[PDB]
């Protein structure tokens, strides 16, 4: 969904925080 298909999603807390690819 973008968070774990860039090298931004998942160094943004909310990817990290919902998404569990994060």
Known sequence: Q???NG???CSS???RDHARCC
Do not use: D
Request: proline share 11%; aromatic share 12%.
């Open 2 to 4: 973008g968070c774990c």
């Open 7 to 9: 090298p931004k999603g």
């Open 13 to 15: 807390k909310w990817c």
